[PDB]
Write an enzyme that holds these catalytic residues in place. Structure first.
Site, PDB file in Angstrom:
ATOM      1  N   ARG A 192       0.761  -1.276   0.129  1.00  0.00           N
ATOM      2  CA  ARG A 192      -0.066  -0.018  -0.182  1.00  0.00           C
ATOM      3  C   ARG A 192       0.821   1.384   0.132  1.00  0.00           C
ATOM      4  O   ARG A 192       0.602   2.078  -0.921  1.00  0.00           O
ATOM      5  CB  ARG A 192      -0.804  -0.071   1.171  1.00  0.00           C
ATOM      6  CG  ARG A 192      -1.993   1.102   1.167  1.00  0.00           C
ATOM      7  CD  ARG A 192      -3.305   0.684   1.663  1.00  0.00           C
ATOM      8  NE  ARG A 192      -4.472   1.827   1.290  1.00  0.00           N
ATOM      9  CZ  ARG A 192      -5.618   1.516   1.348  1.00  0.00           C
ATOM     10  NH1 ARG A 192      -6.041   0.360   1.315  1.00  0.00           N
ATOM     11  NH2 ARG A 192      -6.427   2.593   0.925  1.00  0.00           N
ATOM     12  N   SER A 207     -27.780 -23.598  -4.516  1.00  0.00           N
ATOM     13  CA  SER A 207     -28.934 -23.770  -5.557  1.00  0.00           C
ATOM     14  C   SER A 207     -29.371 -22.465  -6.024  1.00  0.00           C
ATOM     15  O   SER A 207     -30.613 -22.278  -5.766  1.00  0.00           O
ATOM     16  CB  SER A 207     -29.893 -24.778  -5.056  1.00  0.00           C
ATOM     17  OG  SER A 207     -30.336 -24.271  -3.882  1.00  0.00           O
ATOM     18  N   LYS A 243     -28.764 -32.171 -12.596  1.00  0.00           N
ATOM     19  CA  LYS A 243     -28.216 -31.324 -13.661  1.00  0.00           C
ATOM     20  C   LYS A 243     -27.947 -29.995 -12.737  1.00  0.00           C
ATOM     21  O   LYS A 243     -28.320 -28.919 -13.078  1.00  0.00           O
ATOM     22  CB  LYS A 243     -29.124 -30.910 -14.768  1.00  0.00           C
ATOM     23  CG  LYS A 243     -28.482 -29.777 -15.717  1.00  0.00           C
ATOM     24  CD  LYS A 243     -27.354 -30.292 -16.591  1.00  0.00           C
ATOM     25  CE  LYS A 243     -27.165 -29.241 -17.706  1.00  0.00           C
ATOM     26  NZ  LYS A 243     -26.000 -29.735 -18.493  1.00  0.00           N
ATOM     27  N   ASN A 297     -25.033 -27.579 -12.474  1.00  0.00           N
ATOM     28  CA  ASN A 297     -23.600 -27.168 -13.112  1.00  0.00           C
ATOM     29  C   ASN A 297     -22.846 -25.888 -12.328  1.00  0.00           C
ATOM     30  O   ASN A 297     -23.859 -25.315 -11.640  1.00  0.00           O
ATOM     31  CB  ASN A 297     -23.797 -26.576 -14.584  1.00  0.00           C
ATOM     32  CG  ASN A 297     -23.819 -27.751 -15.468  1.00  0.00           C
ATOM     33  OD1 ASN A 297     -24.026 -27.301 -16.628  1.00  0.00           O
ATOM     34  ND2 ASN A 297     -24.043 -28.673 -14.952  1.00  0.00           N
ATOM     35  N   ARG A 343      10.529   8.334 -21.416  1.00  0.00           N
ATOM     36  CA  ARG A 343       9.019   7.725 -21.652  1.00  0.00           C
ATOM     37  C   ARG A 343       9.079   6.929 -22.625  1.00  0.00           C
ATOM     38  O   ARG A 343       9.712   7.311 -23.705  1.00  0.00           O
ATOM     39  CB  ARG A 343       8.153   9.070 -22.039  1.00  0.00           C
ATOM     40  CG  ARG A 343       6.593   9.079 -21.922  1.00  0.00           C
ATOM     41  CD  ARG A 343       5.807  10.174 -22.086  1.00  0.00           C
ATOM     42  NE  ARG A 343       6.610  11.404 -21.661  1.00  0.00           N
ATOM     43  CZ  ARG A 343       6.691  11.600 -20.252  1.00  0.00           C
ATOM     44  NH1 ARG A 343       6.523  10.713 -19.410  1.00  0.00           N
ATOM     45  NH2 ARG A 343       7.481  12.803 -20.090  1.00  0.00           N
TER      46      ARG A 343
END
Lengths: 438, 448, 440, 441
Positions: free
Chosen positions: D182, D267, D273, D275, D306
């Site tokens: 930081r 869920s 099924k 996935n 630069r």
């Protein structure tokens, strides 16, 4: 394959990352293991001596182990088996205590950490050494002026020391980073088959602490067979190092250009920058090797196949690559040749137009910020047309020569007088470098 | 560092990419150079013989050359110097003809191309061999059914042969790619100091063509010291190969999972002494394929990253290619090697595949039933009636075959013999066998 | 995020790889699907018309679909659902025929291939156009001499056309590569749930062939849900293109250097001339390698459909196409309008005061005198031209043995760069030739 | 292109990395510049007010600016010009003070740093939040046993909490890393045309410090137009985060496999099924980020004062990494706080190898009860049989005279119980959670 090895790797680093070093790291773990379990009452002290006597890399055949590994899937099991057959020759009943309660990856990762520690130590040494000499150079040329280059185009003045100080700055920040990760990286890997260390029952923690202490490594909050951030982080800092040295190497090569000829690499212990090539090469090769380590992080469950295997030769290549760049950067940093005269010459290649700004501020006050603006664009447009230095065009400008003497114009068009904070930057950078020391 | 080298690299490939192989490539160039310039009237035939006698890698000291390279910046100049000092011992006046009119990169790139050709040859052999054996296995298991896996979830049936056929397909396409790049890759690098070949004057092209022919390499439209697309393309196809074998390695490791146990790498029940089955049957071979598919992408991007090489010769970017291309070749050679071993010796457990198939208790075959009951009754009525049977087969948890047998409308429309067939995986393989057919077909077409 | 998009991407390419373009590709698949299944007797021709009318990207809400996708896991299912609700409004009983027998990936990959086909077409156009103009420039400057630069050091002479011919060579090779992969890449992706196409029973192949023909795409030997080499290969060649244009962009920026000032990109306000175009080429050559490795990294996709690895492809391939389209665009601008300063090139040539031409004299004095004597005599002259720092032309004129063997007219020629161009003009010739051969 | 954006990026992060956010970052720099120079006596306070009033991203046209950038080579010059034309409408004589003494990159890098700070703040919040919930889950399942999986093969027991504790451990180490960088990352970029700041003369340092203070950024030892390690380091840690969440995403997807069915994704509001749409995002990020990171490493050797091209390559890359990771953290939180566990299925899967995975636990006990040499033989014999006549090892050992004569039926029941061979499982969870609470402060 060792043709390019002397040129790309630092000999001391290659020694650490050799078959001997890899083997020795694991053997160190095995001896330390026996020692630690003996003091927990799991191994007879007579066996501890037998084991230690066999934990010397020299006593094993790499060629043979290599073919076994091809069938084992890792290096630990073929080594442990070979270690056992060596301990059998002398103290047959000691054989049953070698590698007790540990899994292959424990030996492998810990062995690696040991090698990484020696590696860290080299890198910190070289870094500090390079930072010192870079510090001197920065001070030495804190005020020798050279033209600034933006998008490869001439811009307001800069100092050679200013440039070298930037590299110093980055190197200090890397020493800082290596310092912060040290306590994180140097940890023991001791988890057993599935990281539960269940095989040791209640003697688990006692053996673990004894083992860490033995190897002078910290005991982590938990084993890390599939949490590889520690290793990737280390590689990432080495990546930062390659990148900064890559910037340095690029700058040298551009300064050594025939049309520039301001700074040169020392003459062989056309002048080609064979050293800069190494620095640029490393800065080009390492990003790919590093992404490999990041890529292998999502290791499944308690031990991953393939992803874990990908780390094995990758980390060592990174360490070697960087060791070679540091070595080469040291050579050029302490011996580069400077041509201040040529720097001066290149400075008014744009015939003072690069110093227009320095004049614009002064004539801003001497006359009207509004009038000076016009009058200056007019003198530049002319210094270009009738192509001749701006110093002259300004001397033949009534309003200008009526407001600024010949002595004043000589100063304004002198780059040595438009160095801005150049010396200050070198000061702060060198200052911070000395602060870090402690 | 050779501990893991037997496990990750194919011995034949390491031989090509060894110091000896590297040196020989360049020496081969030097000898060929003298020969070609002699026939152009630039070098006395007596020197040609002297040079060729010294163009043997064995006669040089790697250790010494290594230290010299560290100061030279490349490998050509220290080698050429050492070559000259060897030719001086015998025919002193032949020394002035070695490396005539050529620049360091000419020797280095051409030497590399020679190594690449030997490498290309190995890779093509292994690929063809692997494709052959993969072709047989595909046919052999063209119809042994296994459940389909989507997002690692069970899906409609598939065949083991179908899966292997996909790997075959990919391999065929790579053989094809390797073939198309061959004429592009195997070119000579002869341009001299700045690629103008000016030092040879008007004998430039004659020497060039003679040289190409000598090495059995094509002469490119122009030298390519800083146009490296040819090398990057070759690395790229090798990348594609790593990737495909990586998918194969992944599939094996997942099929070898304890909760799957359908396919296994060779070496007894799983791997080695299958005593305590639980573990030990570790997929040591798949680890290599997965490792390569993980390592190569980074090595490949390095070659891409080093393409914007400046002007007539670039420093740094060019140096970055030196060890990278060989690593890629070795990594892939090791994967091909390991893929061959598992391809020809994997163990299949068709019974376990059958068992795994109704782990979802026929729900994965609901679709196969849905189409039939779509016509027997109303596509609209069948839909309702089917979701109802599935919801039940789950609730009172029991096979769908049963739930449907106790379903009045269903058992009234389909006999017990019909339902037995609908809920049989073997009858819902779709184009499984066709895919294997087409893939194997194309594999035999390529041959010629 | 479109600030840097005009600068980094070619507008035509961005159009292809936009939400509209993505959606349209999938919709095109659905319409072609109904059409092909109808001719197989699986769908009533009345529904085919209903479906086609709804297969227009404009009729859908991207924002809404985006949120649905976050829950669906892919783009096909939320699209097909929305398509179904649109077909319901008009022909309610047609709704049950949309996306029949196909899986999400079929629609997604095929849609993508359609977009890649449009993209391939742009890239081939741009390349040929760039090759043409580069070809002329090559010929135009086939013999304007400039110093050779090795490791950024001065080397024997080279010609500007020679340099540009190199870039032409590489581009020709890429056009060739794009030609060879075309039949391999433009294939249909039709395999259904697990690639068996079982849901279509015996009408599988018939529907497949009809569908491929409908979209003017080849039918592959088998579906490729988890065999991604075709896509990675295409990205790989685009990678080759970025790399080559990267070399070109680097060379321009180095020639635009204040201390070089030999070539410039088309255009107080004087010495200020930044290569904004070269920046794009170098940027692409720097960004693409990483994107490419991502595609390679995603190849080991598990079984019949892989999660995560497959998702990684979605935005990566398009980024590559856009990045390269922008590089081609910018390369065209600088190729057809760069400014040459042949005068400055001459001036820079004897910055080493003829030492770079020592070799050209070395061969001539090799025969005039002894190759052994000439060697010595030449190193002596160079060592002097450096010491008392003055052109080599002069040092050689004050050299008895040399001026006794070579006239003043002979030395003027040997130290002239234009006479040591080697095969420069030949290289340009062969390159241009091959460029014209390819055309056909 | 926003179709997949809701799924791959966290809305809050996208807001930071949008045209509006990019623009505002630079405008904030401009306003702060005028403010700082006024207090140094370089700008009339009346102009400071005029400028600030124009430093609002809303007032500018992105489309227009975009076409200008295509010609300018960067974003600062076309914006500064547009800003000037807006300040002219009201206070015409204030126009000459905007962007005074600063170069384009000063506005750009500083603007970016401002954006990175807002981004850093989100990532730290999310990480802490994710660590907290992962912390509870770890404890909650500190002792529910599941089989260990080595090379995808069954191995000695492990605990769900143990597994989750490992992710916690990594996350803690990342928070630690973010904290350490930081002070290094949040610096001002103020160097002018060539980093000399010469245009401000002796008012350079005073204006610089005033400027840093204004933006609440540290003043670096020197400008860093071509020393990019600060940015690459930040991207590198974000890389570490993607990797770790990648491992988590992989484990979930493997636990959700039909043949495993031990852990499931929520869920979210068929064979089953279900996935893992969430895991897909974590795995995708872990697959995409490595490439983006190497790009930033690749762009480090920037030439002189630069660099062109290499610096341009950073512009869109850093933002992509931040968005990608924000999307993975987002998704990781959802599954971490709502995953469903099936302990019964874990138990069932445990003796899929019929106790052979617990052979070691029995081996140590029978090592002492009898001879370590005799027990070894007797055990391999029982395993070889439990496999041959295929039946649980518990049974084979009960029908073993030597074994059943040395261990009661009650003793064998315990030895073949996974819950009794968890080793340090609960301890690991303890240490990890402990360290997590320690960090807090």
């Amino acid at each position: 394959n060792q043709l390019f090895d002397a040129y790309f790797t630092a000999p001391a680093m290659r020694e650490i990352f050799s078959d001997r070093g890899r083997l020795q790291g694991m053997l160190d773990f095995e001896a330390a293991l026996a020692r630690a379990e003996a003091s927990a009452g799991l191994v007879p002290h007579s066996a501890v001596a037998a084991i230690e006597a066999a934990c010397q890399a020299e006593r094993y055949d790499t060629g043979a182990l290599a073919n076994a590994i091809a069938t084992a899937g890792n290096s630990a099991i073929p080594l442990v088996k070979a270690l056992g057959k060596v301990i059998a020759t002398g103290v047959p009943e000691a054989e049953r205590y070698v590698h007790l309660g540990a899994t292959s990856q424990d030996a492998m990762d810990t062995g690696l950490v040991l090698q990484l520690r020696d590696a860290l130590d080299l890198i910190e040494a070289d870094l500090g050494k390079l930072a010192d000499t870079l510090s001197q150079q920065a001070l030495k040329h804190a005020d020798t002026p050279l033209v600034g280059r933006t998008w490869l185009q001439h811009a307001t003045p800069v100092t050679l020391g200013m440039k070298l100080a930037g590299v110093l700055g980055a190197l200090t920040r890397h020493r800082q980073r290596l310092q912060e990760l040290r306590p994180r990286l140097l940890v023991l890997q001791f988890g057993g088959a599935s990281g539960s260390l269940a095989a040791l029952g209640s003697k688990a923690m006692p053996v673990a602490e004894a083992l860490a202490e033995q190897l002078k490594l910290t005991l982590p909050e938990q084993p890390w067979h599939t949490q590889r951030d520690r290793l990737v982080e280390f590689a990432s800092v080495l990546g930062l190092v390659a990148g900064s040295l890559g910037k340095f190497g690029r700058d040298i090569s551009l300064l050594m250009q025939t049309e520039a000829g301001e700074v040169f690499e020392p003459s062989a212990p056309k002048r080609n920058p064979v050293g800069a090539a190494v620095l640029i090469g490393a800065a080009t090769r390492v990003p790919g090797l590093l992404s490999t380590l990041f890529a292998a992080m999502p290791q499944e469950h308690e031990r991953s196949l393939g992803l874990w295997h990908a780390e094995w030769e990758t980390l060592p290549d990174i360490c070697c690559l960087v060791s070679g760049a540091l070595r080469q950067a040291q050579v050029i940093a302490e011996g580069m040749e400077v041509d201040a005269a040529r720097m001066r010459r290149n400075l008014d290649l744009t015939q003072g137009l690069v110093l227009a700004e320095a004049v614009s501020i002064v004539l801003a006050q001497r006359l009207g910020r509004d009038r000076a603006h016009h009058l200056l664009e007019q003198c530049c447009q002319r210094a270009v047309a009738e192509q001749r230095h701006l110093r002259a065009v300004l001397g033949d400008e009534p309003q200008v020569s009526a407001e600024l003497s010949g002595e004043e114009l000589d100063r304004l068009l002198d780059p040595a007088h438009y160095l801005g904070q150049a010396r200050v930057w070198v000061a702060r950078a060198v200052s911070e470098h000395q602060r870090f020391t402690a």
